[PDB]
């Protein structure tokens, strides 16, 4: 009994385009009745909307119950925080609402309220109108946490607005505390520490890990203490435990494994994540990693060209 | 030549587009008394002419384009040094750079237009790409010679990605990545303002180009394991104060037609809102200073090593109290 956990970016897709072999890889598992999940540090859309897109592109039925995205574990926080600043692309508002967050504010809602809060926002008037909403108690009800769902697309605004929140007086908009501290005014969560990721471009691009480093750098500058943030996403144990539960529930719904193989392109997320958790791993060369790159101390079970190689070589050798 | 003033703009004369109460009156007071002044700002984006036209209209005084130093004004000295520059800032900085004489100006939005996948987290709308960017001859086949940050750009995920690409490239060629790690960037990079904070219309101080610089530097360190060797101008740098001193000298000569740092004046008073730029800059250069409370500085904030000559409420108090004591 083996199962697979596939990364998406640099393994199944580059952007919206499938990698050759990705469709065949999943079709092969389905023929053989081998369970799989998708475990991605990407996000932005609902689990349903994302799996609908992947299903269409790869010509397989991927269930919303087979996927863990960066933000999926934020379901665990819905009873902890009444009002959240949900940072990400505009779609993350709906995702957070769907999880059951009581009071969701998107960062663009603050830009709508007062453009002078974010002097270097690139939002056009049309983008403000489309992306944001009027929040009538934006200034009178405190924020309880900042949750970064995915990489937002207006960083001078996004970073300013996050900084305002984590240096505020107890989460109240338009306030600035006097006290310097490593503990932010309200808690802040990052869902992906990937410095780099693989999109259609030939060179690795910065991801949410890079965004996090930037937020942290300015927090340190203002406070003289490092930020006490929360982190999820691969390689964190929290995300692997979450994925493990999704996989167990999926395996039951198909109806515990001798081995789980993480298939990834990034040593620093996928491979270390699996290795720390006790999962096996197959490092592909179609994304962040190029053969010759420093593996440091991760030790992938197999190193292979692409996802179809990962599945076929793993099955031949281990199933 | 008893005295001249050098005024900061943001948090001293203006908050955003709105004059601070007394700002117009302060300049009119100097002009009635034939006391010369310059404007020395770490802001920028538009030409010295366009900027002084706007300020003139809003303060109802005649400010000459020869009376202003903006963050990027000293980039005039670099025009024969670097053929192709990545001119980073708001779209208006393309025209400012071209106006200065740079041979081959590329704006960061030109690279986003060339390939959107370079900047996956760009916020540019299609309409903004059409408005801001240009097709650039030989974008992919001619090296970039430097990155010059003119002012704060307004799409930082793209801006930071694109700057990082340049300073880690194979000798400035787009679409490349060098093999080696070093403190020395692939091509030189200049920042024109190290202001962590600045004062706009909002009541809380907002991050400025100094913050942007710290972000670029952080990701450079992450990729290279060595701190970035950059060039920095703007207040409080000696380069910028020297440049401003020469603009003042030239302006006084024009009008007319001591210490080394104030020549030909007995005293030069910097009027600023930011201890970390205006005050320490003036102090290190040899100028006197007035610190106002209408911008970044709040009463009781720690002044660290800065010792302003006077601390006052606003720009009109700065002028009136300085003239009383020092004129
Ligand atoms: Mg990946
Ligand atoms: Mg935009
Ligand atoms: Mg100022």
XYZ file of C-alpha atoms and ligand atoms in Angstrom:
649
model
C 0.000 0.000 0.000
C 1.466 3.272 -1.287
C -0.061 6.758 -1.749
C 1.215 9.854 -3.452
C 1.101 13.554 -2.516
C 1.768 15.760 -5.536
C 2.966 19.292 -5.439
C 1.439 21.422 -8.231
C 3.759 24.283 -9.299
C 6.808 22.858 -11.075
C 5.406 19.259 -10.851
C 1.959 19.118 -12.518
C 1.782 22.652 -13.955
C 3.870 25.644 -14.901
C 1.257 28.390 -14.458
C -1.916 27.281 -16.248
C -0.091 24.848 -18.574
C 0.210 21.183 -17.666
C 3.674 19.704 -17.611
C 3.959 16.837 -20.072
C 3.402 13.607 -18.231
C 1.211 15.115 -15.492
C -2.075 13.922 -16.935
C -0.674 10.425 -17.628
C 0.769 10.286 -14.098
C -2.611 10.773 -12.457
C -4.380 8.532 -14.994
C -1.880 5.795 -14.209
C -2.586 6.088 -10.465
C -6.325 6.012 -11.078
C -6.025 2.886 -13.318
C -4.043 1.198 -10.548
C -6.431 2.448 -7.805
C -3.549 4.190 -5.993
C -4.761 7.091 -3.850
C -3.308 10.550 -4.191
C -3.732 14.026 -2.820
C -2.494 17.367 -4.105
C -0.450 19.328 -1.510
C 0.383 22.795 -2.734
C 1.711 26.001 -1.160
C -0.240 27.867 -3.832
C -3.744 29.118 -3.216
C -6.225 31.903 -3.816
C -9.307 30.062 -5.016
C -11.629 27.711 -3.220
C -10.660 24.045 -3.096
C -13.611 23.388 -5.374
C -12.722 26.022 -7.953
C -9.071 24.946 -8.010
C -9.804 21.256 -8.446
C -12.367 22.077 -11.144
C -9.678 23.906 -13.110
C -7.053 21.152 -12.602
C -9.622 18.467 -13.574
C -10.398 20.257 -16.831
C -6.734 20.773 -17.755
C -5.468 17.247 -16.868
C -8.579 15.318 -18.065
C -9.053 13.537 -14.706
C -11.583 13.955 -11.944
C -9.819 15.634 -9.026
C -12.135 15.960 -6.019
C -12.184 19.063 -3.793
C -11.523 16.471 -1.040
C -8.083 15.603 -2.503
C -6.440 19.003 -2.182
C -4.615 20.968 0.461
C -3.630 24.520 -0.498
C -1.622 27.000 1.572
C -4.725 28.359 3.300
C -6.809 25.178 3.724
C -5.660 24.724 7.313
C -6.967 28.189 8.185
C -10.258 26.331 8.692
C -8.839 25.569 12.157
C -8.821 29.306 13.042
C -12.459 30.214 12.361
C -13.457 29.983 16.019
C -10.327 31.793 17.280
C -10.581 35.156 15.491
C -13.799 37.111 14.916
C -12.408 39.646 12.461
C -9.532 38.797 10.156
C -7.520 40.765 7.680
C -7.480 38.185 4.858
C -4.461 39.129 2.721
C -4.138 37.721 -0.785
C -5.657 38.084 -4.213
C -9.253 39.372 -4.149
C -10.636 35.799 -4.356
C -9.353 35.070 -0.867
C -12.229 37.043 0.635
C -14.703 34.448 -0.652
C -12.470 31.586 0.359
C -12.316 32.913 3.967
C -16.064 33.531 4.044
C -16.592 29.950 2.840
C -14.488 28.560 5.698
C -16.855 30.384 8.067
C -14.891 33.423 9.230
C -17.438 35.760 10.817
C -16.011 39.082 9.638
C -13.579 39.152 6.731
C -11.757 42.298 5.614
C -9.561 42.196 2.482
C -6.571 44.537 2.274
C -8.146 46.387 -0.662
C -11.056 47.372 1.594
C -8.619 49.554 3.541
C -7.369 51.155 0.307
C -11.009 51.844 -0.670
C -11.613 53.531 2.721
C -8.560 55.830 2.514
C -6.140 55.797 -0.404
C -3.636 57.800 1.665
C -3.055 54.772 3.883
C -1.239 53.159 0.927
C 0.441 55.921 -1.035
C 2.258 53.464 -3.318
C -0.734 51.275 -4.117
C -0.911 50.488 -7.811
C -4.655 49.896 -7.794
C -6.519 51.730 -10.535
C -9.894 53.245 -9.603
C -11.508 50.361 -11.526
C -9.509 47.758 -9.601
C -10.464 49.337 -6.281
C -14.125 49.170 -7.282
C -13.924 45.557 -8.426
C -11.733 44.061 -5.718
C -12.884 45.826 -2.587
C -16.032 46.228 -0.524
C -17.467 48.912 1.817
C -16.948 47.777 5.389
C -19.046 50.073 7.573
C -17.300 49.179 10.899
C -13.808 49.009 9.448
C -12.608 51.636 11.952
C -14.741 50.804 14.981
C -14.363 47.022 15.293
C -10.925 45.693 16.126
C -9.092 43.245 13.926
C -8.236 39.977 15.693
C -5.607 38.510 13.322
C -3.870 38.915 9.994
C -4.036 35.773 7.795
C -2.031 35.709 4.606
C -3.924 33.341 2.312
C -1.707 33.720 -0.755
C 0.594 36.272 -2.411
C -1.316 39.545 -2.888
C -0.586 41.576 -6.044
C 0.039 45.115 -4.676
C 2.880 44.785 -2.269
C 3.555 48.413 -1.300
C -0.027 48.596 -0.118
C -0.178 45.038 1.235
C 2.992 45.427 3.292
C 2.028 48.904 4.622
C -1.418 47.682 5.647
C -0.081 44.513 7.317
C 2.508 46.639 9.178
C -0.199 49.025 10.356
C -2.194 46.106 11.756
C 0.688 44.395 13.604
C 1.863 47.759 15.121
C -1.650 49.035 15.933
C -3.253 49.646 19.265
C -4.880 46.223 19.786
C -5.906 45.799 16.156
C -7.788 49.073 15.749
C -7.441 50.713 12.347
C -5.851 54.230 12.292
C -3.805 53.593 15.465
C -0.118 53.069 16.282
C 1.070 51.645 19.583
C 3.901 53.195 21.600
C 5.362 49.930 22.854
C 8.047 48.142 20.852
C 7.818 44.348 21.089
C 8.490 41.115 19.169
C 4.859 40.198 19.819
C 2.679 41.825 17.166
C -0.417 43.788 18.192
C -2.523 41.017 16.768
C -1.370 37.584 15.532
C -0.111 37.178 11.983
C -0.088 33.967 9.949
C 1.824 33.204 6.773
C 0.684 30.173 4.789
C 3.744 29.622 2.522
C 7.449 30.216 3.323
C 8.637 29.422 -0.203
C 11.354 31.876 -1.157
C 11.157 30.618 -4.756
C 8.652 28.870 -6.979
C 8.324 27.743 -10.583
C 5.866 29.510 -12.939
C 5.995 29.602 -16.777
C 9.138 31.779 -16.720
C 12.516 30.132 -17.178
C 13.917 31.617 -13.920
C 12.597 30.857 -10.459
C 10.338 33.595 -9.069
C 9.877 34.908 -5.516
C 6.935 33.503 -3.590
C 5.184 34.114 -0.316
C 8.343 33.275 1.649
C 9.950 36.327 0.074
C 6.836 38.426 1.015
C 7.158 37.156 4.566
C 10.835 38.118 4.745
C 9.835 41.667 3.710
C 7.108 42.004 6.316
C 9.518 40.681 8.933
C 12.287 43.050 7.882
C 10.123 46.152 8.392
C 8.722 44.825 11.644
C 12.261 44.396 12.947
C 13.095 47.880 11.784
C 10.259 49.472 13.710
C 10.461 47.334 16.890
C 14.114 46.245 17.218
C 12.782 42.719 17.922
C 12.032 39.923 15.434
C 8.425 39.256 14.532
C 6.661 36.494 16.421
C 4.588 35.183 13.540
C 2.835 31.917 12.834
C 3.838 29.875 9.793
C 2.094 27.131 7.927
C 2.450 25.496 4.522
C 5.085 22.955 3.521
C 7.500 22.130 5.137
C 5.645 22.647 8.420
C 4.447 19.723 10.516
C 1.099 21.468 10.821
C 0.531 21.272 7.060
C 1.744 17.641 6.808
C -0.519 16.556 9.661
C -3.415 18.324 7.900
C -2.524 16.634 4.574
C -2.196 13.292 6.323
C -5.740 13.626 7.687
C -7.129 14.676 4.275
C -5.396 11.583 2.758
C -6.771 9.215 5.409
C -10.296 10.592 4.899
C -9.862 10.304 1.114
C -8.680 6.722 1.403
C -11.771 5.924 3.534
C -14.019 7.612 0.993
C -12.488 5.486 -1.714
C -13.407 2.526 0.411
C -2.917 2.968 6.654
C -0.218 3.139 3.933
C 3.164 1.429 3.974
C 4.613 4.531 2.303
C 3.585 8.004 1.147
C 5.622 9.576 -1.639
C 5.767 13.366 -1.805
C 6.462 14.441 -5.392
C 7.985 17.940 -5.442
C 10.279 20.365 -7.226
C 11.504 22.332 -4.185
C 13.937 20.803 -1.717
C 13.201 23.555 0.818
C 9.443 22.884 1.006
C 8.414 19.583 -0.541
C 11.437 17.413 0.227
C 12.377 18.680 3.685
C 8.679 18.673 4.559
C 8.257 15.031 3.624
C 11.562 13.974 5.136
C 10.798 15.699 8.504
C 7.333 14.115 8.560
C 8.598 10.592 7.769
C 7.281 10.459 4.208
C 9.265 9.344 1.201
C 9.946 11.733 -1.648
C 10.613 12.126 -5.354
C 12.394 15.327 -6.420
C 11.659 16.313 -10.026
C 13.686 18.655 -12.267
C 10.791 20.504 -13.957
C 10.668 23.320 -11.363
C 12.778 25.080 -8.735
C 15.475 22.381 -8.492
C 18.067 21.831 -11.193
C 20.444 18.872 -10.976
C 23.689 20.144 -9.452
C 21.918 22.441 -6.987
C 22.928 22.200 -3.354
C 20.673 19.693 -1.684
C 22.023 20.668 1.694
C 20.745 17.969 3.947
C 17.587 16.861 2.316
C 17.816 13.387 0.889
C 15.141 12.669 -1.621
C 14.198 8.974 -1.997
C 14.457 9.391 -5.789
C 15.581 12.217 -8.038
C 13.887 12.050 -11.467
C 13.256 14.184 -14.551
C 9.477 14.689 -14.328
C 6.303 13.674 -12.592
C 5.663 10.722 -14.884
C 9.159 9.457 -14.025
C 8.403 10.008 -10.346
C 5.298 7.783 -10.477
C 6.695 5.093 -12.781
C 10.098 4.785 -11.032
C 8.469 4.845 -7.590
C 5.934 2.163 -8.470
C 8.548 -0.108 -10.104
C 10.881 0.153 -7.143
C 8.496 0.391 -4.144
C 4.969 -0.884 -5.049
C 24.141 86.969 2.884
C 23.404 86.671 6.593
C 21.130 83.681 6.088
C 19.484 81.218 3.672
C 16.867 78.507 4.233
C 16.597 75.009 2.819
C 13.031 73.689 3.154
C 11.970 70.111 3.184
C 8.592 69.611 1.404
C 6.729 66.573 2.792
C 5.671 67.286 6.390
C 6.953 70.866 6.237
C 5.341 72.708 3.273
C 2.806 70.031 2.171
C 1.035 66.914 3.240
C 0.353 65.312 -0.163
C -1.021 67.906 -2.522
C -2.285 70.088 0.343
C -0.235 72.972 1.687
C 0.442 73.025 5.411
C -1.067 76.079 7.124
C 1.558 78.825 7.188
C 3.718 77.334 4.428
C 2.733 79.951 1.851
C 3.120 82.690 4.476
C 6.621 81.481 5.418
C 7.918 81.700 1.844
C 6.162 85.066 1.297
C 7.850 86.309 4.488
C 11.251 85.289 3.127
C 10.528 86.899 -0.231
C 9.441 90.222 1.378
C 12.766 90.183 3.218
C 14.816 89.107 0.175
C 16.084 86.101 2.104
C 16.977 83.318 -0.286
C 15.820 79.751 -0.092
C 15.929 76.380 -1.784
C 13.718 73.307 -1.553
C 15.481 70.064 -0.655
C 13.232 67.050 -0.822
C 13.709 63.288 -0.874
C 10.499 63.170 -2.929
C 10.512 63.046 -6.696
C 8.826 61.630 -9.769
C 8.268 64.656 -11.981
C 10.685 67.042 -13.554
C 12.085 69.890 -11.493
C 10.055 72.202 -13.730
C 6.753 70.332 -13.337
C 7.254 70.009 -9.574
C 8.005 73.703 -9.022
C 5.038 74.661 -11.306
C 2.749 72.704 -9.021
C 4.277 74.071 -5.805
C 4.158 77.647 -7.208
C 0.475 77.322 -8.006
C -0.447 75.835 -4.645
C 1.599 78.228 -2.436
C 0.981 81.347 -4.593
C 4.717 82.056 -4.811
C 7.108 81.918 -7.715
C 9.413 78.904 -7.174
C 12.040 78.603 -9.864
C 13.021 75.221 -11.267
C 16.550 76.349 -10.240
C 15.534 76.366 -6.532
C 14.756 72.659 -6.060
C 16.665 69.459 -5.352
C 14.637 66.279 -5.502
C 15.825 62.743 -4.718
C 16.798 62.095 -8.344
C 18.141 65.471 -9.313
C 21.774 64.359 -8.702
C 21.293 61.492 -11.181
C 22.156 64.134 -13.794
C 25.796 63.327 -12.910
C 25.384 59.717 -14.119
C 24.179 60.311 -17.684
C 27.576 59.719 -19.331
C 28.343 56.778 -17.039
C 25.520 54.349 -17.942
C 24.050 53.855 -21.416
C 21.076 51.691 -20.546
C 19.405 52.201 -17.195
C 16.511 50.505 -15.496
C 14.760 53.700 -14.271
C 12.589 52.546 -11.387
C 9.741 54.666 -10.073
C 6.331 55.939 -11.122
C 5.792 56.014 -14.871
C 6.652 59.736 -15.007
C 10.278 58.914 -14.170
C 10.803 57.638 -17.786
C 10.373 61.226 -19.020
C 12.471 62.668 -16.220
C 15.359 60.298 -17.008
C 15.077 60.900 -20.728
C 14.992 64.667 -20.005
C 18.253 64.405 -18.062
C 19.916 62.836 -21.112
C 20.062 59.132 -20.341
C 20.635 57.371 -23.689
C 18.456 54.276 -23.283
C 15.843 54.368 -20.554
C 13.855 51.292 -19.606
C 11.002 51.552 -17.090
C 10.130 48.557 -14.945
C 6.670 48.306 -16.532
C 8.370 47.690 -19.931
C 9.670 44.384 -18.585
C 6.260 43.392 -17.205
C 4.736 44.181 -20.627
C 7.445 42.115 -22.351
C 6.641 39.045 -20.277
C 3.964 39.065 -17.603
C 5.343 35.846 -16.150
C 8.460 37.709 -15.023
C 6.282 39.392 -12.400
C 3.616 36.951 -11.318
C 2.358 39.245 -8.565
C 2.205 42.434 -10.629
C -0.961 44.375 -10.008
C -0.932 46.055 -13.411
C -4.238 46.044 -15.240
C -4.168 45.708 -19.022
C -5.182 49.344 -19.167
C -2.233 50.332 -16.930
C 0.207 48.317 -19.065
C -1.041 50.229 -22.163
C -0.814 53.542 -20.356
C 2.569 53.145 -18.673
C 4.793 50.871 -20.704
C 6.599 50.920 -23.991
C 8.061 48.548 -26.515
C 11.819 48.795 -26.157
C 14.239 48.179 -29.018
C 16.728 45.532 -28.154
C 15.249 44.922 -24.692
C 16.543 41.339 -24.744
C 19.796 41.840 -26.666
C 21.481 44.809 -25.005
C 22.695 44.802 -21.451
C 21.502 47.026 -18.700
C 24.301 49.118 -17.199
C 22.666 50.244 -13.924
C 19.489 50.303 -11.887
C 18.505 53.841 -10.763
C 15.614 54.154 -8.323
C 14.151 57.606 -8.993
C 11.222 57.471 -6.579
C 8.962 54.861 -5.040
C 7.276 52.744 -7.717
C 3.708 51.605 -7.181
C 3.799 47.793 -7.893
C 6.318 46.391 -5.477
C 6.012 42.657 -6.142
C 6.950 43.375 -9.761
C 9.377 46.159 -8.949
C 11.345 44.101 -6.388
C 11.347 40.977 -8.584
C 12.614 42.921 -11.572
C 15.294 44.751 -9.595
C 16.420 41.451 -8.098
C 16.623 39.910 -11.584
C 18.884 42.757 -12.739
C 21.256 42.752 -9.806
C 21.663 38.947 -9.947
C 21.812 38.752 -13.763
C 24.625 37.777 -16.027
C 26.215 41.254 -16.397
C 22.932 43.036 -16.815
C 21.342 40.869 -19.522
C 17.583 40.340 -19.206
C 16.465 36.685 -18.813
C 19.723 35.581 -17.129
C 21.033 34.577 -13.712
C 24.708 34.584 -12.750
C 26.278 31.581 -11.100
C 28.270 33.365 -8.439
C 27.212 34.867 -5.175
C 28.697 38.149 -4.124
C 28.103 41.372 -2.224
C 28.710 43.121 -5.538
C 25.584 43.298 -7.681
C 25.753 42.311 -11.322
C 25.281 45.958 -12.243
C 25.324 48.999 -9.936
C 22.193 49.985 -8.127
C 21.362 53.461 -6.818
C 18.698 54.455 -4.310
C 17.803 58.112 -4.142
C 16.149 58.261 -0.696
C 16.720 56.161 2.441
C 13.659 57.542 4.280
C 12.110 54.711 6.265
C 9.127 56.969 6.948
C 7.515 60.078 5.526
C 4.477 62.289 6.119
C 1.601 62.279 3.592
C -2.046 63.304 4.229
C -2.635 60.336 6.532
C -2.142 60.877 10.243
C 0.292 57.924 10.679
C 3.717 58.001 9.115
C 3.971 55.904 5.951
C 6.877 53.855 4.633
C 9.083 55.554 2.058
C 11.887 54.583 -0.329
C 14.120 53.665 2.605
C 11.712 50.857 3.366
C 11.730 49.786 -0.305
C 15.541 49.753 -0.183
C 15.555 47.582 2.960
C 13.297 45.097 1.092
C 15.522 44.918 -1.991
C 18.514 44.490 0.347
C 16.846 41.731 2.327
C 16.211 39.551 -0.730
C 19.673 40.275 -2.101
C 21.162 39.002 1.166
C 18.921 35.951 1.020
C 20.173 35.003 -2.460
C 23.844 35.983 -2.017
C 24.718 35.530 1.668
C 26.452 38.916 1.566
C 25.009 42.406 2.033
C 24.280 44.429 -1.084
C 26.860 46.933 -2.215
C 24.566 49.766 -3.260
C 24.921 53.508 -3.845
C 22.645 55.755 -1.856
C 21.919 59.415 -2.239
C 19.218 61.720 -0.837
C 19.285 63.358 2.589
C 21.183 62.709 4.855
C 24.039 61.885 2.466
C 26.963 64.204 1.942
C 26.517 63.802 -1.823
C 23.062 65.337 -1.670
C 24.001 68.153 0.717
C 26.991 69.033 -1.525
C 24.650 69.042 -4.534
C 22.124 71.226 -2.674
C 24.883 73.561 -1.495
C 25.935 74.080 -5.112
C 22.333 74.689 -6.234
C 22.083 77.333 -3.466
C 25.410 78.927 -4.442
C 24.310 79.059 -8.056
C 20.900 80.477 -7.111
C 22.452 83.218 -4.927
C 24.814 84.094 -7.810
C 21.779 84.366 -10.092
C 19.935 86.571 -7.552
C 23.022 88.775 -7.050
C 23.585 89.221 -10.786
C 31.217 82.290 6.562
C 31.844 78.557 7.050
C 32.861 76.212 4.209
C 29.535 74.415 4.320
C 27.352 77.571 4.355
C 29.343 79.754 1.941
C 28.518 82.420 0.845
C 26.066 82.655 3.786
C 26.795 83.094 7.459
C 24.218 80.386 8.215
C 21.997 77.977 6.299
C 18.913 76.653 8.122
C 17.435 73.292 7.096
C 13.719 73.157 7.979
C 12.645 69.554 8.290
C 10.236 67.096 9.847
C 12.445 63.993 9.898
C 15.372 63.713 12.319
C 16.769 60.731 10.329
C 17.059 62.652 7.094
C 16.695 66.425 7.356
C 18.200 66.995 10.787
C 21.081 64.535 10.846
C 21.855 65.474 7.242
C 22.068 69.186 7.985
C 23.943 68.566 11.236
C 26.603 66.353 9.598
C 27.047 68.780 6.725
C 27.471 71.833 8.944
C 24.105 73.538 8.503
C 21.765 74.658 11.250
C 18.369 73.108 11.544
C 14.830 73.599 12.571
C 12.744 70.579 13.395
C 8.979 70.987 12.947
C 6.105 68.901 14.418
C 3.882 68.846 11.332
C 5.313 65.600 9.855
C 7.298 62.527 10.884
C 8.564 63.801 14.253
C 6.222 63.919 17.224
C 7.012 65.743 20.462
C 8.850 63.416 22.826
C 10.207 61.095 20.093
C 13.797 60.150 20.804
C 16.218 62.322 18.911
C 19.138 59.891 19.039
C 22.207 61.683 17.861
C 20.377 64.610 16.277
C 20.531 68.014 17.944
C 18.281 70.371 16.038
C 19.162 74.033 16.444
C 15.466 74.719 17.224
C 12.358 72.561 17.619
C 9.153 74.395 16.636
C 5.529 73.665 15.780
C 5.553 74.460 12.117
C 7.345 76.036 9.166
C 6.124 79.584 9.821
C 7.365 79.361 13.447
C 10.655 77.988 12.102
C 11.135 81.029 9.847
C 9.926 83.618 12.334
C 11.922 82.274 15.292
C 15.094 81.758 13.219
C 14.972 85.321 11.846
C 14.432 86.668 15.363
C 17.463 84.878 16.849
C 19.814 84.309 13.914
C 19.073 87.146 11.421
Mg 6.430 23.430 -6.483
Mg -2.786 47.978 -10.570
Mg 9.755 65.531 5.203
